[PDB]
Design a protein around this ligand. Structure first.
Ligand code: HEM
Ligand code: HEM
Ligand code: HEM
Ligand code: UQ2
Ligand code: UQ2
Ligand code: FES
Lengths: 49, 378, 61, 49, 70, 75, 241, 54, 54
């Protein structure tokens, strides 16, 4: 996914300690404008829309 | 001596359908046992004829199902009788369990517990059935379901991958499901015989819950014909469904071939699991959801331990009747919610209904029995 | 021609299980035909969309 | 004393052809079995179809 | 296309589209239509009012349509 | 098991019966029949009906809230 | 986008419980399929011989199959030549790989027609309301010039262009090809391709209702007759003293 | 039984289905076999009754 | 797979790819023969010994 400037800022502003799986956005991406993920949900394996 | 009474083979028949002392007052509600019997055979017979043309390969699975409805002589009715019979099998199954609950029939522990095994078995059976056409709902249904098992700590991932035969619901998974869907109904039958074996130690219960040794009649004119009239009524319901509305209870999407990349916005079970489905997603937890999903069915095994009333049936107990009907009404809510998206209203009502289901069976119904005993000075 | 009517049916055909069976089998044969044509014609009337059109296209073979 | 054992009136349930104590039942027997067997014959014919 | 074939759809749609329920819905359409035109940085986009109009119209469409269709 | 003749002990009960070929299959069918169904209905409505309307109501409300929710005025 | 509208209830001539199809209307609808739809829509499950009992005759059905070329089996050299068209073949034609549909129409596939009516939600109504009810984009919602507008579509961003008024046709005897008319026929035909058994089933269903209406009372009377003995049984208790 | 004029597609699938269901039926019959056998018990090499030494 | 297109291939798929698919396949094949050797002993035993009188 190609993320715009607005989406990069919104993920960096997320209160990390309230998350179910604590992780900063910048340790989930190499370049801030590109997020690469597996289209498999961690609950029961469906594909996130 | 006779011939019926003495012959090793006929004895069994005689002792089960001819001279069997039956209560003179059992009503429709007692018919669902024979109706399940008919549904079991109907499922096996149409099931076999479908297997004579069906292919268990992803390449031709859907096509073979289509081949049946257009090309195979009368292949279409057979196919719809099968599909709709599976639903008829669940309507009868639900009447049967409910009848047992209202009437106290569960006090026959072995019979009932065997009945729970029979419920689970036809459930496991029908789930695998629905995957066979390899429709979008077959595949995503197969996916959503099996993956539940991945919530079991430390063993869940290996378990799900073991039954999958890969990392997804693929080739190995379809063929697999065919084989199990073929053998399961035979095993069901052997168990239905053990069910009937335990039932015979006491004979049937009746609406009053009071013993009927004082007024038994032969199964031989009375219940043979009443079962006959009743099977005819099952045929009407089934045929009305298949010859006029064969997709009414079906999902128009299982008509689009499986696509492991296309997740439908939909994604729901066949109607007979909708209540359990609603209970499952009411929980904001992976483990708890499946722990409570399981518990919504296995609770039938706790029922006899929660009998608290001094009377067996509900015929004479008003307070208990209300609670029972609220259970059935709560189960409509659950299925209705289960067939709806997890967005507004639906989340909190389906959440509270789940609590109610368990508050009802586990706390409310027993408490009512104690109160009722007390009102009667017992 | 009414009391004696079901009486004759019983006397001549229902008494023995022999005739009883023979009559319902002879009775199944005729009935099948009468019900089939009789019901086809009811399905025929409420419609008139299928092969009533045949008269046109064919014949030119 | 077992001589007091009545036999409850069944007029309420008796077919019309058997309502008179004054006459035989043998007369209406054929029509009566006829009627009841016709029902089962017609049924089997139906089921056969 | 330019002028020559009488669409029954178009014919019956006129009489239909007109009628009470649709007059009112189209009123809100236009009302809301003109709001969205009158701005810049907005997003309340009129998708809804259109469908409501269509529903009311289309129910009446079906009821009166097919009769003439041969 | 079970059988007949080994069920239980019963004394002093007479049972008058009549042959099926001498009685009617549907005696006062509509006459006594319909009153009975109404009476059976009265006896049970207050125990069966209420739970269900509670769902009927929860169903129609539940649907209205959902559909009305996907709409919006200001903000 | 997350908002939607549901189709009306059109009085199809096959809507009633015991209602056949208009077989003349399945024809014209096949005609609509043949030229228009076919270029983009695969109908993998219908064959030419399937039409024989339905609309056309042996001869006519042969001819329509002969107006295409198939790619028949290999001979001596391991070939792949062309053949006139039997009656035995089906209607798989548009293009091979699903990706070719995308390459053409643009990352979108005109979903196969053979099962459409039965796969939508709303039957022929969804499709009829779609095809006939094309309209114009209201305020603030711009598209992508390949994403046309249809209110009867999830999200409303559809990849199909409105192809119903392109007045083609061979309504043999004489039927005007208005947008409405071509749409009824195309859907009437589609009902048939999705559910070919449709009529025969309703004929059996008619017979099922008549048989049951005869059988039901009879079995009931058989059972009541046998239960008679019990229903009118009278009890009396006569204890000693 | 062929499902055509030869041993083709229809014939193979057919044979699968019957080959799947037959052994279950065999089993039900093997139980009836054992049911009748039980009325007398087993025979023995001498062919003489063995009630005297079971 | 019960389809002529993949029937043989699926049988081959079992012996090379399916873990321990080969023994299962040969146990099946050879078990069918074992089933006939036992069947023949059984019938013969019955014949020699007069067991058929049941
Ligand atoms: C393959 C599924 C089943 C079959 C074939 C089956 C068959 C029968 C039959 C023939 C009877 C006797 C007649 C009647 O009362 O209906 C019966 C009674 C009973 N069954 Fe089932 N049944 C099945 C599933 C169940 C289930 C799901 C339960 C509940 C867990 C259940 C528990 C009982 C009980 C307790 C009775 C005794 C009822 C009474 O006498 O009042 N069985 N069943
Ligand atoms: C051993 C007897 C049975 C056999 C041989 C059998 C075989 C089949 C086959 C080959 C299919 C795929 C064809 C199709 O989808 O129509 C199928 C589908 C299915 N069967 Fe069975 N089955 C049997 C008993 C059952 C039972 C006990 C149930 C549970 C009520 C069941 C419920 C289903 C369901 C729900 C489907 C999928 C829905 C559909 O018809 O499309 N069948 N079965
Ligand atoms: C009157 C003949 C046609 C009919 C009846 C027809 C019917 C349909 C239907 C029912 C759908 C799917 C609706 C849905 O997904 O909910 C569809 C999708 C589509 N069709 Fe057609 N169509 C016809 C002719 C064409 C033609 C000629 C083209 C080539 C311009 C075309 C290109 C498409 C495409 C691209 C889609 C996919 C839209 C998308 O999902 O993005 N179709 N059609
Ligand atoms: C994807 O759609 C779904 C189905 O259709 C394929 C289901 O059938 C079920 C429920 C199924 C079962 C077997 C629950 C019972 C579990 C135990 C341990 C008894 C769910 C939740 C579902 O989401
Ligand atoms: C006295 O109570 C009972 C009835 O009256 C409610 C029945 O109708 C039946 C009917 C059961 C049948 C016909 C067997 C079906 C089972 C299989 C595996 C095919 C039984 C056993 C019974 O006990
Ligand atoms: S939320 Fe359950 S699979 Fe995604």
């Amino acid at each position: 996914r190609h993320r715009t400037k607005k989406e990069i800022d919104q993920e960096a502003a997320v209160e990390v300690s309230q998350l179910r799986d604590p992780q900063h956005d910048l340790e989930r991406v190499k370049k801030p404008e590109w997020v690469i993920l597996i289209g498999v949900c961690t609950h029961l394996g469906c594909v996130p829309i | 001596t006779n011939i019926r009474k003495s012959h090793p083979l006929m004895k069994i028949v005689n002792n089960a359908f001819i001279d069997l002392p039956a209560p003179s007052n059992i009503s429709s509600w007692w018919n669902f046992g024979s109706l399940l019997g008919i549904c079991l055979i109907l499922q096996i017979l149409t099931g076999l004829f479908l297997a004579m043309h069906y292919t268990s390969d992803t390449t031709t699975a859907f096509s073979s199902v289509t081949h049946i409805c257009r090309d195979v002589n009368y292949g279409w009715i057979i196919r719809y009788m099968h599909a709709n019979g599976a639903s008829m099998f669940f309507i009868c199954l639900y009447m049967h369990v409910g009848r047992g609950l209202y009437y106290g029939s569960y006090t026959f522990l072995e019979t009932w517990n065997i009945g729970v095994i029979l419920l689970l078995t036809v459930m496991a059976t029908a789930f695998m059935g629905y995957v066979l056409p390899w429709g979008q709902m077959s595949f995503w249904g197969a996916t959503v379901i099996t993956n539940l098992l991945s919530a079991i700590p430390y063993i869940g991932t290996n378990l799900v991958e073991w039954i999958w035969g890969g990392f997804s619901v693929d080739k190995a998974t379809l063929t697999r499901f065919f084989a199990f869907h073929f053998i399961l109904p035979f095993i069901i039958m052997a168990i239905a015989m053990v069910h009937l074996l335990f039932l015979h130690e006491t004979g049937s219960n009746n609406p009053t819950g009071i013993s009927s040794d004082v007024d038994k009649i032969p199964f031989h004119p009375y219940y043979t014909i009443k079962d006959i009239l009743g099977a005819l009524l099952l045929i009407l319901a089934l045929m009305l469904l298949v010859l006029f509305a064969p997709d009414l209870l079906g999902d128009p999407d299982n008509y689009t071939p499986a696509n492991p990349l296309n997740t439908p916005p939909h994604i729901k079970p066949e109607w007979y699991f909708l209540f359990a489905y609603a209970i499952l997603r009411s929980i904001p937890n992976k483990l708890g959801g499946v722990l409570a999903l399981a518990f919504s069915i296995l609770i039938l095994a706790l029922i006899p331990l929660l009998h608290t009333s001094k009377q067996r049936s509900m015929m004479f107990r008003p307070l208990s009747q209300c609670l029972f009907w609220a259970l059935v009404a709560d189960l409509l809510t659950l299925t209705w919610i289960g067939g709806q998206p997890v967005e507004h209203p639906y989340i909190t009502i389906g959440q509270l209904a789940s609590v109610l289901y368990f508050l009802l069976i586990l706390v409310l119904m027993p408490t009512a029995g104690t109160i009722e005993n007390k009102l009667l000075k017992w | 021609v009414a009391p004696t009517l079901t009486a004759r049916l019983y006397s001549l055909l229902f008494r023995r299980t022999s005739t009883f069976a023979l009559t319902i089998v002879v009775g199944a044969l005729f009935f099948e035909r009468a019900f089939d044509q009789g019901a086809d014609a009811i399905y025929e009337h409420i419609n008139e969309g299928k092969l009533w059109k045949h008269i046109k296209h064919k014949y030119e073979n | 004393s077992h001589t007091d054992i009545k036999v409850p009136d069944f007029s309420d349930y008796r077919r019309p052809e058997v309502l008179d104590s004054t006459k035989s039942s043998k007369e209406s027997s054929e029509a009566r079995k006829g009627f009841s067997y016709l029902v089962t014959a017609t049924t089997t014919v139906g089921v056969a179809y | 296309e330019e002028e020559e074939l009488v669409d029954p759809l178009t014919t019956v749609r006129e009489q239909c589209e007109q009628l009470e329920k649709c007059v009112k819905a189209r009123e809100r359409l236009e009302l809301c239509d003109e709001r969205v035109s009158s701005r810049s940085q907005t997003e309340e986009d009129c998708t809804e009012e259109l469908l409501d109009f269509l529903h009311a119209r289309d129910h009446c469409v079906a009821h009166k349509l097919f009769n003439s269709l041969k | 098991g079970r059988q007949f003749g080994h069920l239980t002990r019963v004394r002093h009960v007479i049972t008058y019966s009549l042959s099926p070929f001498e009685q009617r299959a549907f005696p006062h069918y509509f006459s006594k029949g319909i009153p009975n169904v109404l009476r059976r209905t009265r006896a049970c409505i207050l125990r069966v009906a209420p739970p269900f309307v509670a769902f009927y109501l929860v169903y129609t409300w539940g649907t209205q809230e959902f559909e009305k929710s996907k709409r919006k005025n200001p903000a | 986008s997350d908002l939607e509208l549901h189709p009306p209830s059109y009085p199809w001539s096959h809507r009633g419980l015991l209602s056949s199809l208009d077989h003349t209307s399945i024809r014209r609808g096949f005609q609509v399929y043949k030229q228009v739809c076919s270029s983009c829509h695969s109908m993998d499950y219908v064959a030419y011989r399937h039409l024989v009992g339905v609309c056309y005759t042996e001869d006519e059905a042969k001819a329509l199959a002969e107006e295409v070329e198939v790619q028949d089996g290999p001979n001596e050299d391991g070939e792949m030549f062309m053949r006139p068209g039997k009656l035995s073949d089906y209607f798989p034609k548009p293009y091979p790989n699903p990706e070719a549909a995308r390459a053409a129409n643009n990352g979108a596939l005109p979903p196969d027609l053979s099962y459409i009516v039965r796969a939508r939600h709303g039957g022929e109504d969804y499709v009829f309301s779609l095809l006939t009810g094309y309209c114009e984009p209201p305020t603030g919602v711009s598209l992508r010039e390949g994403l046309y507008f249809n209110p009867y579509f999830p999200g409303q961003a559809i990849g199909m262009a409105p192809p119903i008024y392109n007045e083609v046709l061979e309504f043999d005897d004489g039927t005007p090809a208005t947008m409405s008319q071509v749409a009824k026929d195309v859907c009437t035909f589609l009902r048939w391709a999705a559910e070919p058994e449709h009529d025969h089933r309703k004929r059996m269903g008619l017979k099922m209702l008549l048989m049951m209406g005869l059988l039901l009372p009879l079995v009931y009377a058989m059972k009541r007759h046998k239960w008679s003995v019990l229903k009118s049984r009278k009890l009396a208790y006569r204890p000693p003293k």
